[PDB]
Write a protein that binds this ligand. Structure first.
Ligand SMILES: Nc1ccn([C@H]2C[C@H](O)[C@@H](COP(=O)(O)OP(=O)(O)OP(=O)(O)O)O2)c(=O)n1
Ligand SMILES: [Ca+2]
Lengths: 974, 411, 399
DNA sequence: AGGTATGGCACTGGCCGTCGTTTT
DNA sequence: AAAACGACGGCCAGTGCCATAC
């Protein structure tokens, strides 16, 4: 209907009729009275909201009697064949290992009692599969071992058996393992440990068209069943604060520990040499049999682990949607073209330039410092007095010119004398010394002449070294810097006369007097630490954004950039040296940390014959261009909350100014004739918590102040919770997200005020404290009413804590069980914050699973030509044919709608507010970027995507525009 | 100021030539100075060699070209350019009374329209070779022609001639990529200038437009008195090429992928004399500890320093020391390392004065031989950058130096 | 002759066919040189510089300018520079015309500037200040390489690239030094030639100046001068510094004396032409000396996968360039011709060795090598080619 | 008590290989 | 001429801080 008892615009009449049941029970009088009293007391019962337009859609027919049955049937239909294959694996009888491993190239199947026969492909419905790669030769797969019911299979690479001078560095599908049966039935299942890495080496996985093959990961199921958190992992490894009964039921993600936990018996032994990581191709050739044996051992252990694991997973997560979503999450796919190569170069070179300018600036400062050795002048430098200036002795074992004609004699005599004196090498020690003439501190900075990476001067210097601040003579409020072992970086305040390789304290006092003539210590800051004794001075820690306990590791941290602008942090040379150094550091930090991961991404380029016909004929088909793909190595469940993990693509930064290589995601570009259609959930966890509280309180949407405020705020009007908080405190909305989610999940007031001070440079201590207090007192009150009762969010906190303290906590929507390592019996009250956050985070995981299931169903039903591309914890992208780009958008919106209603249905509510029915915007683009309008200008590409690469702007469309462009139908002819 | 000290140093150590009053800023910038001393010649040669290596050596589509220093034939009337005239041309007209009343005033038209001019830029000569240099690459359109040479500019005697040696590249590109390439070179050249600089920030770039609406870039160096232009990049389109070859256009076609087109012309032109002066100012670096290290030295880049090594002797048996020094001198010279033969000068000063003189001359290393060198073959070595002393065996010296320069390119 | 046609076709001599002739090339009023000619001239200049300047402590570079401003000698023969402003000023208010033509043409000689005719005067203008560098040790020299302008009979202007050495020596030993320099220069000219006998020396005398020598090369049409050595005494040095002679004094055996001047001047363009003629002496090929050949090695690909062979050749090309060997990248053309034509083209360009990379090279690493002189084919491993070429060049130099 | 994940560089410490000096 | 021994140097492993994503 058009409204609920609290006058909140609910779902349209037609949509509500199509989705929810007609005979929905009405709320009682008492519940409505309580909700109205609550809202009036908080002061929200008056505000009238302007209604939003109405949407009328003839949705595709549903199955079952309600939403839950519909989703269950869809998930079962999706996941039936792969569950059948897993069951086939569970009941397998495997013969013993072959007596000897074959040497031929390709695939060999081992028959009974050792017989070996060459086969093109394993041709099995299920497998346990493992691969090994020679890291010295690059990324080409080296050799693989697979097992199926009643058969062993071995695969040898062409680069392992044959020897040739040159192997191509560009990787084609012809250099990967063939594993897919051509056009005994359609579906195939592959099981492995860290199975994504093995999937990355399959030739058929790189086709633009999707494949029926799916993959299951033993590590993901271990995380689902008995995983541990990072802190728990560290404690578990160190066990070789009060409760410890959880140790015996948990383990780390390493294969050996998993096998010990789920199977036991004889331990698993590694290969001590570690040839595949450190050896060479010849070393692999010589040790063929042993490496094959180890590979087979690992495969067998993984097979046993899966046999033990599967029933427990099926028991602790009984809803089929979880398995369907996990299956769908393992088929990620990223397209790329030749531009990727250029992106690797442009960034790298740029980085080097910014490196060079930095090193040249510091190296020079080092050189002049060497001149201070003479006369012990270094004993007077406030920054360098405490360095190592000792030299080392060199070691040894115990009249009128006239034209001439006989120049040959002079030449030969000089050459002979030179060579005779050259031969006196018998007295030279066999191990050359390393710059004994220079000082020790300068000696450390220089490489050794034998190093093949040698360069002149102290070319190892960097901004992160503890000597660089001394060389730059950094000053803080007119005080020189200093490093203490216990307390990190601080500064020295002169004036002590209680005597608090000797400190040149008079030089420091003179320097401070010079500084002062430009405008029990008498200076106030992080407080003196008398445990550090530097006669004639006090040591004061540099303030840290996380409090006085933490230690500063480098004054050139990004957070110190404003202090440079304010002039509190000043460099000795003066001018723009310090600010420029900090700017360069900020600009190159991300690339410095991530270039090894980014440049080593495995890329396979599809030949022309393997491309779709719709791509060759497109007018945008760039001939002489390269088209390829990258398959992210995502662990479907690498987190206790069952989130995904990827070393590179889940840490990629968005295109940002003044950050080299920030256009990483923009390089993922659809091929000609293809588009990327994507969407992100709006205020996901906020809404989840709000609806949980609403269900707990009175069973109506908006019956709580928190949910009431959450529902109405619009993104376009800038009235959502994030924007309101940002305006109230005066920070970016991105920082507002951090502030709000920190407050929600147990952050204390000191943390919030420190965060505000960090994000708002113009604030002060008292103002930040007041703005934190005026936002922490209203949300929560006192514990209870006997001498969470009061507060806007009290009901939500009570609901979350009730779920957390349950004997077997489960996700309210799908009822997945939390890991055995975090149940109350194993841990009494230890890791409360993690358990509380788990409810909402695993609910978000369930949301992702439901979205994936719905999208797959909609794409299959209406013959939509597209496939899943990628997701990051709340966002989904799809690769679609251009002509269908609009239809897909509609599907996404519908997938959102149902996904919301399901969340209400399992909570006992039979209606959905109109506000959260649809995605605020759906993005249609040709590359991956946060917004469709950004041109992504960075130091690595100044011109931008539009000019350098010719990628035009995308489009963002809402529900009404999509309806106008599609007429509300998903059919291929409207 | 510090500029006077730098100019005095450059005069004393024969970087420049002339007198104090002749070496004014205006004369140096305009190119109407007496000239450069041997050290300046060596520095300019090193700069030109580095430019040639960075522009021509490592590219398969850039070829050398030579343009004559003068342009003969008829000229359009005007432009105030100088005119080349032989001796007897001053007599064969006046004699015989060739209408000696007033027609020899209209003879100024003949003077304007018949006498040749001195080369003003390298662009025209390069464009003159476009057709015949198309055979090298079978008409693969993206390619360049490079040259280094002296050009003459009139400067307000009443009018003098300023000579400037400059490096020019003319790059023919497909039109649809002309802008992209214009960016590329703009970065590439900007890197090169920054490569050898101690303070690469003082090198800057700026966008600019022509009265015809043609994009361009200009590179400037920040001298102590302000920014001065050192290089220019112009996207000239095809107007000049079409005007130079009016007629059948198909003769000018080149290959862009599978298509035949007429290329856009990108012209890059940089001044080598002004670049040398800019590097001289940069190396002198005109903070208590830095101030107290008031040592005069020209910290030129090792790839550009005119002199690499200084060789001398101690006190002892003169003949043997001179023999070993001669051997070392010949060995160092035979492998491409320039040396200053200090051993051939009598003793007149202590080590402090030699260090000061060699620092003012920007010599990378100072080598010292003694009796103990004859005893065991160990020599003393002092480095310009740090001034620290090291002991080293002669058997390795030739290699070490060859390493130090060779790796300097890859810092 | 066929040689000039080959030079035109292979980009040694620039311009069209009609613009090339014996007289034009000898005079220096020809269109110019192609890139191969430019590289050959540069190699010749580098050899001259290393032979004359590098291995001597008392020879220094000099930086003479191309023109001399200010008042000039009246009359005399040379190229003067005229001002268009000084004639444009008459276009608006005539200065009575009539009788001022002869006076104006005399003012032309009075005030006009002149183009450099030789490198001797530029060096003489640096003698006094360059004497400081040697602490007045009288024996020492100044060397330069540069272009000079010569009238040629409407008079035309010819440009010649020349190498000049000015040697100041005590008058006692001037003749001995003249003989020494004659010997050394003759040896240097004979060094790179396949037929050293075609280089000859002769003695000559002048009314002004002392004994002198001339160096000639025997082109097919006769002997042509390529270098001249003169013992000019001290007339010019005094004439440039009238009156006082105390500054002009230099040291010799602890006594001061005014030095005698020896002038050596050689023509680089004519020398390049002579070497081109020398090398050409039933297969058309230029056996230019390895130290002077503009291009050392040519590279090409065989039949096979284009990307792989192109990557291999790119790596080899980068490696060869990094070590100082000039390379002709023929692999970019995709080998659209037979092998005989390719060999003929590379021979006419005077390339020392031809390198061919085939698909078979991907297997074991063997490339085909052809030699310009012997024409014998060989198989060599890629890893050894660079060192082989470097050793070959070194051996050619040492002999 | 924010939660969950990922990774890199700088610095410290321990072990073991290998050399040159000193005994026999 | 062969063996004990004290020192230097390179690799591996570990801890801390900082920087990314949601
Ligand atoms: N510092 C953070 C960032 C994110 N999250 C969680 C909760 C968020 O809901 C979820 C998704 O992150 P967004 O930044 O995409 O969050 P919204 O969905 O709230 O943002 P918007 O509606 O602006 O897209 O990640 C968190 O707990 N702490
Ligand atoms: Ca979101």
């Amino acid at each position: 209907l058009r409204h609920n008892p609290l006058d909140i615009q609910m779902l349209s009449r037609g949509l509500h009729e199509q989705i929810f049941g007609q005979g929905g029970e009405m709320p009682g009088e008492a519940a409505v009275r309580r909700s109205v009293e609550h809202l009036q007391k908080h002061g929200l019962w008056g505000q009238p909201a302007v209604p939003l337009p109405d949407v009328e859609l003839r949705l595709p027919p549903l199955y079952g009697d309600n939403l839950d049955q519909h989703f269950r049937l869809l998930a079962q239909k999706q996941s039936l064949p792969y569950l059948e294959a897993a069951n086939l694996l569970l009941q397998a009888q495997l013969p013993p290992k072959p007596p000897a491993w074959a040497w031929a190239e390709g695939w060999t199947r081992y028959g009974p009692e050792g017989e070996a026969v060459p086969v093109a492909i394993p041709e099995e419905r299920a497998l346990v599969f493992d691969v090994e790669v020679c890291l010295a030769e690059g990324t080409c797969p080296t050799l693989a071992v697979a097992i199926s019911p009643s058969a062993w299979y071995s695969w040898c690479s062409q680069r392992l058996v044959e020897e040739r001078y040159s192997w191509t560095s560009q990787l084609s599908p012809a250099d990967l393992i063939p594993l897919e049966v051509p056009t005994d039935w359609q579906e195939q299942l592959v099981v492995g440990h860290n199975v994504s890495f093995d999937r990355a080496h399959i030739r058929e996985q790189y086709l633009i068209q999707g494949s029926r093959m799916r993959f299951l990961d033993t590590m993901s199921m271990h995380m689902a069943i008995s995983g541990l958190s990072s802190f728990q992992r560290s404690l578990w490894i160190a066990a070789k604060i009060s409760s410890w009964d959880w140790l015996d039921i948990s383990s780390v993600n390493s294969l050996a520990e998993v096998h010990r936990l789920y199977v036991g018996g004889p331990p698993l032994e590694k290969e001590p040499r570690e040839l595949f990581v450190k050896g060479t191709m010849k070393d692999i050739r010589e040790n063929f049999q042993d490496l094959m044996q180890y590979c087979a051992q690992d495969v067998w252990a993984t097979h046993e682990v899966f046999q033990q694991q599967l029933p427990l997973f099926l028991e602790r997560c009984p809803h089929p949607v979880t398995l369907a979503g996990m299956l769908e999450m393992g088929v990620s796919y990223l397209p790329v073209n030749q531009n990727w190569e250029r992106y690797l170069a442009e960034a790298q070179g740029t980085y080097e330039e910014l490196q060079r300018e930095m090193k040249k600036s510091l190296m020079d400062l080092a050189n002049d410092a060497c001149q201070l050795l003479s006369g012990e002048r270094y004993k007077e430098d406030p920054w360098l007095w405490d360095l190592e200036w000792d030299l080392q002795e060199f070691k040894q074992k115990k009249l009128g010119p006239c034209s001439e004609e006989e120049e040959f004699q002079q030449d030969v005599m000089a050459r002979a004398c030179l060579q005779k004196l050259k031969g006196t090498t018998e007295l030279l020690p066999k191990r050359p010394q390393h710059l004994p003439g220079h000082p020790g501190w300068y000696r450390k900075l220089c490489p050794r002449l034998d190093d093949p990476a040698w360069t002149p001067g102290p070319s190892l210097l960097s901004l992160q070294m503890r000597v660089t601040p001394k060389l730059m003579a950094l000053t803080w409020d007119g005080f020189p810097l200093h490093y203490s072992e216990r307390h990190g970086w601080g500064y020295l305040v002169p004036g002590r006369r209680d005597n608090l390789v000797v400190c040149p304290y008079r030089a420091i006092e003179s320097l401070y007097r010079k500084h002062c003539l430009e405008q029990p210590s008498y200076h106030h800051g992080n407080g003196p630490y008398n445990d550090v004794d530097i006669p004639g001075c006090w040591f004061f820690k540099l303030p840290h954004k996380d409090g006085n306990s933490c230690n500063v590791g480098s004054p050139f941290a990004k957070d110190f950039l404003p202090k440079m602008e304010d002039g509190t942090l000043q460099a000795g040379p003066g001018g723009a040296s310090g600010p420029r150094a900090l700017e360069i550091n900020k600009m190159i930090s991300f690339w410095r940390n991530a270039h090894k991961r980014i440049s080593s991404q495995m890329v396979v380029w599809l030949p022309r014959s393997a491309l779709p016909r719709a791509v060759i004929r497109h007018p945008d088909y760039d001939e002489e261009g390269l088209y390829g793909a990258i398959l992210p190595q995502v662990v479907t469940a690498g987190t206790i909350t069952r989130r995904a993990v990827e070393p590179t693509w889940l840490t990629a930064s968005n295109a940002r100014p003044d950050r080299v290589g920030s256009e990483l995601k923009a390089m993922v570009q659809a091929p000609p004739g293809y588009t990327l259609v994507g969407a992100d959930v709006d205020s996901q966890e906020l809404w989840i918590a709000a609806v949980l509280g609403d269900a707990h309180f009175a069973g109506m949407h908006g019956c709580t102040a928190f949910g009431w405020m959450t529902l109405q705020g619009r993104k376009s009007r800038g009235t959502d919770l994030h924007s309101k908080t940002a305006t109230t405190v005066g920070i970016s909305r991105e920082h507002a997200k951090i502030f709000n989610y920190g407050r929600i999940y147990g952050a204390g007031q000191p943390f919030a005020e420190r965060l505000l001070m960090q994000f708002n440079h113009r604030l002060t201590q008292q103002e930040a404290a007041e703005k934190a207090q005026q936002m922490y007192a209203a949300t929560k009150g006192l514990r209870w009413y006997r001498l969470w009762k009061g507060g806007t969010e009290s009901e939500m906190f009570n609901k979350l804590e009730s779920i957390a303290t349950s004997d077997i906590p489960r996700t309210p929507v799908l009822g997945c069980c939390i890991s055995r390592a975090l149940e109350p019996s194993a841990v009494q009250e230890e890791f409360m914050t993690s358990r509380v956050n788990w409810v909402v985070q695993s609910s978000a995981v369930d949301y992702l699973h439901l979205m994936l299931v719905a999208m797959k169903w909609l794409f299959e039903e209406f013959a939509i030509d597209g496939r899943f591309c990628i997701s990051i914890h709340d966002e989904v992208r799809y690769l679609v044919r251009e002509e269908d780009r609009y239809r897909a958008a509609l599907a996404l919106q519908i997938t959102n709608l149902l996904t919301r209603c399901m969340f209400a249905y399992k909570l006992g509510l039979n209606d959905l507010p109109q506000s959260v029915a649809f995605f605020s915007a759906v993005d249609i683009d040709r590359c991956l970027r946060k917004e469709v309008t950004m041109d992504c200008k960075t130091p690595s590409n100044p011109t931008g995507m539009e000019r350098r690469y010719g990628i035009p702007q995308g489009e963002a469309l809402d529900i009404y525009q999509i309806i106008e462009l599609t007429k509300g139908s998903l059919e291929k002819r409207s | 100021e510090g500029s006077e000290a730098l100019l005095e140093i450059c005069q004393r150590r024969h970087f420049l030539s002339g007198s104090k009053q002749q070496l004014s800023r205006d004369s140096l910038l305009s190119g109407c100075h007496p000239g450069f001393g041997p050290l300046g010649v060596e520095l300019r040669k090193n700069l030109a060699a580095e430019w040639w290596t960075s522009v021509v050596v490592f590219r398969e589509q850039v070829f050398p070209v030579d343009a004559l220093h003068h342009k003969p034939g008829p000229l359009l009337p005007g432009d105030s350019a100088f005119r080349l005239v032989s001796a007897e041309t001053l007599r064969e007209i006046l004699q015989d009374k060739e209408l000696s009343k007033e027609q020899l005033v209209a003879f100024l038209e003949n003077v304007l329209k018949t006498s040749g001019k001195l080369r003003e830029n390298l662009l025209h000569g390069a464009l003159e070779h476009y057709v015949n240099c198309l055979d090298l690459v079978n008409k693969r359109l993206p390619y360049g022609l490079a040259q280094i040479g002296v050009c003459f500019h009139p400067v307000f005697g009443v009018k003098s001639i300023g000579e400037k040696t400059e490096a020019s590249l003319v790059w023919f590109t497909p039109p649809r990529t002309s802008n992209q390439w214009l960016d590329f070179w703009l970065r590439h050249r900007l890197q090169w200038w920054r490569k050898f600089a101690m303070s690469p920030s003082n090198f800057s770039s700026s966008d600019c437009q022509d009265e015809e609406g043609r994009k361009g870039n200009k590179l400037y160096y920040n001298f102590p008195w302000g920014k001065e232009l050192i290089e220019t990049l112009w996207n000239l389109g095809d107007h000049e090429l079409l005007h130079m070859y009016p007629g059948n256009v198909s003769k000018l076609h080149g290959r862009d992928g599978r298509k035949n087109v007429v290329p856009c012309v990108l012209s890059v032109n940089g001044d080598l004399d002004r670049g040398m002066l800019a590097y001289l100012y940069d190396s002198f670096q005109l903070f208590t500890r830095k101030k107290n290290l008031h040592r005069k030295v020209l910290k030129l880049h090792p790839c550009l320093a005119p002199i690499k090594v200084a060789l001398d002797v101690g006190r002892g048996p003169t003949l043997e020391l001179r023999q070993v020094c001669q051997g070392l001198f010949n060995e160092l010279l035979e492998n491409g390392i320039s040396v200053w033969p200090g051993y051939l000068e009598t003793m007149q000063s202590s080590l402090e004065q030699l260090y000061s003189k060699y620092d003012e001359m920007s010599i990378l290393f100072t080598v010292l031989v003694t009796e103990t060198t004859l005893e065991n073959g160990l020599i003393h070595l002092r480095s310009r950058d740090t001034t620290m002393k090291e002991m080293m065996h002669i058997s390795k010296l030739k290699d070490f130096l060859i390493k130090y320069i060779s790796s300097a390119k890859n810092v």
